Design an enzyme around this catalytic site. Structure first.
Site, PDB file in Angstrom:
ATOM      1  N   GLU A 172       0.842  -1.179   0.000  1.00 25.45           N
ATOM      2  CA  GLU A 172       0.000   0.000   0.000  1.00 25.45           C
ATOM      3  C   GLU A 172       0.890   1.247   0.000  1.00 25.45           C
ATOM      4  O   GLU A 172       0.530   2.284  -0.563  1.00 25.45           O
ATOM      5  CB  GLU A 172      -0.952  -0.016   1.194  1.00 25.45           C
ATOM      6  CG  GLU A 172      -1.773  -1.315   1.323  1.00 25.45           C
ATOM      7  CD  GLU A 172      -2.682  -1.595   0.116  1.00 25.45           C
ATOM      8  OE1 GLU A 172      -2.840  -0.722  -0.770  1.00 25.45           O
ATOM      9  OE2 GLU A 172      -3.238  -2.716   0.049  1.00 25.45           O
TER      10      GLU A 172
HETATM   11  N1  LIG Z   1      -3.216  -9.879  -0.798  1.00 27.46           N
HETATM   12  C1  LIG Z   1      -3.037  -8.622  -1.220  1.00 27.46           C
HETATM   13  N2  LIG Z   1      -1.971  -8.366  -1.999  1.00 27.46           N
HETATM   14  C2  LIG Z   1      -1.755  -7.121  -2.450  1.00 27.46           C
HETATM   15  N3  LIG Z   1      -2.487  -6.029  -2.243  1.00 27.46           N
HETATM   16  C3  LIG Z   1      -3.554  -6.322  -1.472  1.00 27.46           C
HETATM   17  N4  LIG Z   1      -4.515  -5.437  -1.045  1.00 27.46           N
HETATM   18  C4  LIG Z   1      -5.386  -6.164  -0.283  1.00 27.46           C
HETATM   19  N5  LIG Z   1      -5.059  -7.433  -0.180  1.00 27.46           N
HETATM   20  C5  LIG Z   1      -3.894  -7.543  -0.922  1.00 27.46           C
END
Ligand SMILES: Nc1ncnc2[nH]cnc12
Length: 278
Positions: A172
């Site tokens: 994120e």
């Molecule tokens: N498993 C995941 N991998 C990458 N971004 C994500 N955002 C939410 N779940 C995720």
């Protein structure tokens, strides 16, 4: 099925969990830089190339998180097209995966990679503590996982907490400057007291609407029809994002979205390849 090239990343970004806040920012910036489609930016923010149509996910990169400058890495396996975390590699060589049967010879960790899987709802994100120690502990608990032992409920519970922590502080963070800035703000030298923090509602919304925010900025780049005034950025109020300039300051790197009048998947990939993208 099945995923291709998980073993052959397009690049690897490395971070020492004891390193400076500036080095972390550099680490995140480098990921965005290496992921970008050179032929496609929006408001001077990088855009990922489209997901390649008619094949399984075949573009990956690795992120290595280390306890120390000389320690061996906890390796993350992440898609180079949508920055999805699907695998991680513990110290005994075991690739662990977050989707059953996705990765070659990997072992299903026991739970999914979605925030609903890891927590219990997308709105629990504002409850997860991040920070240098949370990062180091998350790295330890994952890297310490051995191919033999009993997936105790307790062990799983700790493991979901760990993946949730790294998704936030690595994935994120790459996607959002708000998130990366927040994490960097938690990192201090040893002379500063240890610190923790949880993301607020604006960042939660941002994280849950990456496609929406990406698509919203991408629409402002479309050149307009005759006789109509050019497009205006459309606010996502829950995200605290009301203008295009605010969206640009918020997006770390955009997900590719086909918007009406914008680049198609085929065309953006064509431009990506022409500029030397792989
Ligand atoms: N498993 C995941 N991998 C990458 N971004 C994500 N955002 C939410 N779940 C995720």
């Amino acid at each position: 099925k099945m995923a291709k090239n998980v073993d052959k990343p397009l690049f690897t970004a490395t971070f020492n969990v004891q390193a400076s806040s500036a080095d972390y920012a550099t680490f995140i910036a480098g990921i965005r830089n290496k992921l970008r489609n050179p032929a496609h930016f929006s408001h001077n923010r990088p855009v990922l190339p489209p997901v390649e149509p008619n094949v399984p996910p075949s573009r990956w990169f690795h992120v290595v998180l280390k306890a120390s400058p000389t320690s061996a890495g906890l390796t993350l396996a992440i898609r180079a097209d949508n920055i999805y975390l699907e695998g991680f590699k513990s110290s005994d060589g075991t690739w662990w995966e977050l989707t059953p049967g996705l990765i070659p010879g990997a072992t299903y960790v026991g739970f999914g990679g979605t925030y609903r899987d890891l927590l219990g709802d997308t709105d629990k994100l504002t409850n997860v503590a991040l920070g240098r120690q949370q990062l180091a502990d998350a790295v330890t608990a994952l890297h310490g996982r051995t191919k033999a032992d009993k997936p105790s409920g307790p062990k799983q519970q700790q493991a979901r907490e760990a993946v949730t922590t790294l998704l936030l502080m690595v994935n994120e963070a790459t996607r959002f400057q708000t998130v990366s800035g927040f994490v960097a703000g938690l990192l201090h030298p040893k002379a500063v007291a240890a610190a923790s923090g949880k993301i607020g509602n604006e960042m939660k919304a941002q994280v849950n609407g990456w496609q929406d925010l990406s698509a919203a900025l991408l629409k402002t780049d479309v050149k307009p029809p005759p006789g109509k005034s050019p497009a205006k950025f459309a606010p996502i109020e829950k995200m605290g994002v009301r203008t295009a300039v605010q969206a640009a300051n918020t997006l770390g790197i955009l997900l590719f979205v086909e918007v009406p009048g914008g680049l198609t998947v085929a065309k953006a990939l064509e431009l990506f390849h022409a500029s030397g993208g792989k």
